[PDB]
Amino acid sequence: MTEYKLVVVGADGVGKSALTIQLIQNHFVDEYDPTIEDSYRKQVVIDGETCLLDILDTAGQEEYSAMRDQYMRTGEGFLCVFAINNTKSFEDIHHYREQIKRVKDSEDVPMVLVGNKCDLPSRTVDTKQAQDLARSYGIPFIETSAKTRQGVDDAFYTLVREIRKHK
Ligand SMILES: Nc1nc2c(ncn2[C@@H]2O[C@H](COP(=O)(O)OP(=O)(O)CP(=O)(O)O)[C@@H](O)[C@H]2O)c(=O)[nH]1
Ligand SMILES: [Mg+2]
């Protein structure tokens, strides 16, 4: 059975846990409970292949920033999440990407840029600007909503395809 080690990263509050819980449990968490580190092992069929997804839901709190090298070494693909209503979270993306590239000593690590909270009207990050950043990295970009489930399956399945396409 093919196993994929997915790691969800991004700033504190972007919706990493809500995205993961929506993918796995099909419901939206309204409450904000800061994550330390949670892991899920889930079986899914993607493109006719039975996949075992090992999903690591990480801490966005900068206080847990020394925990990152370990999961960056074991992780095969990274869901780099920002929120479309949080400009700082979009600027933090580059720091996450650089750190991943350094830990794995590679310019070609499977990644997907995710612009979450697309259900909200308070956008501060233009879709075109996010698309241009993803293009500069050579990675896919998808907008998602952990609330409506828009783009959620596509974001995780695209990351699996990036790990598989890189393999
Ligand atoms: N409207 C809307 N709210 C969202 C969405 N995703 C998450 N949220 C909300 O944002 C807040 C933080 O979500 P959460 O999933 O805990 O973010 P996180 O990135 O895991 C926080 P931490 O880094 O500390 O673990 C919660 O109030 C949650 O309901 C979304 O797509 N749309
Ligand atoms: Mg969380």
Residue numbers in the entry: 1 to 167
Can you quote the paper on this entry?
KRAS is the most frequently mutated oncogene and belongs to the protein family of small GTPases that function as binary molecular switches involved in cell signaling. Although KRAS could serve as an excellent target for many cancers, no therapeutic agent directly targeting RAS has been clinically approved. The main reason for this is the lack of druggable pockets on the surface of RAS. The shallow, polar pocket situated between the switch I and switch II region of KRAS (SI/II‐pocket) is of particular interest because it is present in the active, oncogenic form of KRAS.
By using GDP‐KRASG12D, we exchanged the nucleotide with the non‐hydrolysable GTP analogue GMP‐PCP (GCP) to yield a novel crystal form amenable to high‐throughput crystallization, which mimics the beta sheet dimeric form of active KRASG12D. By using our approach, a new “snugness of fit” scoring function and the first crystal‐soaking system of the active form of KRASG12D, the protein–ligand X‐ray structures of a tricyclic indolopyrrole fungal alkaloid and an indoloisoquinolinone have been successfully elucidated.
